[PDB]
Every structure is written in structure tokens, then in C-alpha cells.
């Protein structure tokens, strides 16, 4: 994890769209290449798409996702099974 003294990390071009999607008042999916961005409490309820190497998969943001980064809900290895 990151140090506490730096605080949580988020990207500006996401933070310029978190601020936009709060003030816009819509349920529109915003597709995002920033997997590495910590979810903020003003991001809750937003269906947003995190890239996973190939596509953009929309993720509903809930209460218990705040400390986690965005990339944990967009799997990159589309594994199925050997059998």
C-alpha cells in the first residue's frame, strides 16, 4: 500500500471527471483507463468502466469499495479452465 503521509492516489483526468459526473447528475457510464486510482466517497453509485487490457467493463461503485483501487473490478486474464 501507499504511505499514509502522501494520502490516497487518484488521477487528475479522472478527478476532473469525478467532479464533472457529480455536478452533471446522470447515470451515464464513464469509461476510464485509470485502473490505478483509489475510489473516493463521491464516486459511489457511479457505473464506470475500467479498462482491462482489451475492453471497458462497467463497474457499479458501492460503499465498501473506497480503499480499493479501480483495477480490482476489471479482470485482465480471461481465464476459463483447462478441462
Partner 1 sequence: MKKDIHPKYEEITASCSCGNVMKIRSTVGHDLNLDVCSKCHPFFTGKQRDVATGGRVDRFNKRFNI
Partner 2 sequence: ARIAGINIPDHKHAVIALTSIYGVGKTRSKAILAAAGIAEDVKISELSEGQIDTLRDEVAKFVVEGDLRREISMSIKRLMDLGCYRGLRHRRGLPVRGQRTKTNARTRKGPRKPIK
Partner RNA sequence: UCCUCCUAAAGAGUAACGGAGGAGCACGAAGGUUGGCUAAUCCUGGUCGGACAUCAGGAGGUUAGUGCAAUGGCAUAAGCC
Partner RNA sequence: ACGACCAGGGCUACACACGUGCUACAAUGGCGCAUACAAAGAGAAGCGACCUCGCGAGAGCAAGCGGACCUCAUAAAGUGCGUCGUAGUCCGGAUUGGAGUCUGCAACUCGACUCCAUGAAGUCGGAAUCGCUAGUAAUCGUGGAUCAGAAUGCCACGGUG
Partner RNA sequence: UUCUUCUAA
Partner RNA sequence: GCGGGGUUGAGCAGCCUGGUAGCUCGUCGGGCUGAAAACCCGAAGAUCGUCGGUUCAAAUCCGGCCCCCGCAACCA
Binding-site ranges for partner 2 (CB under 8 A): 62, 64-65, 68, 71-73, 75
Q: Is 15 in the site for RNA (CB under 7 A)?
A: no
Closest CA to 45 of 71, 25, 67: 25
Q: Which of 40, 51, 58, 65 binds RNA (CB under 7 A)?
A: 51
Query: CA Rg, the chain, in Å?
Result: 14
Q: Is 80 in the site for RNA (CB under 7 A)?
A: no
Q: Is 52 in the site for RNA (CB under 7 A)?
A: yes
Distances (CA, A) of 80 to 52, 73, 77: 16, 17, 9
Amino acid at each position: 500500500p501507499r504511505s499514509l503521509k502522501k494520502g490516497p492516489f487518484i488521477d487528475l483526468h479522472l478527478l476532473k471527471k469525478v467532479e464533472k459526473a457529480v455536478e452533471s447528475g446522470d447515470k451515464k457510464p464513464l469509461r476510464t483507463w485509470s485502473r490505478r486510482s483509489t475510489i473516493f466517497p463521491n464516486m459511489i453509485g457511479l457505473t464506470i468502466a475500467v479498462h482491462n487490457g482489451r475492453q471497458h467493463v462497467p463497474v457499479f461503485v458501492t460503499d465498501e469499495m473506497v480503499g480499493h483501487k479501480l483495477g480490482e473490478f476489471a479482470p485482465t486474464r480471461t481465464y476459463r479452465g483447462h478441462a
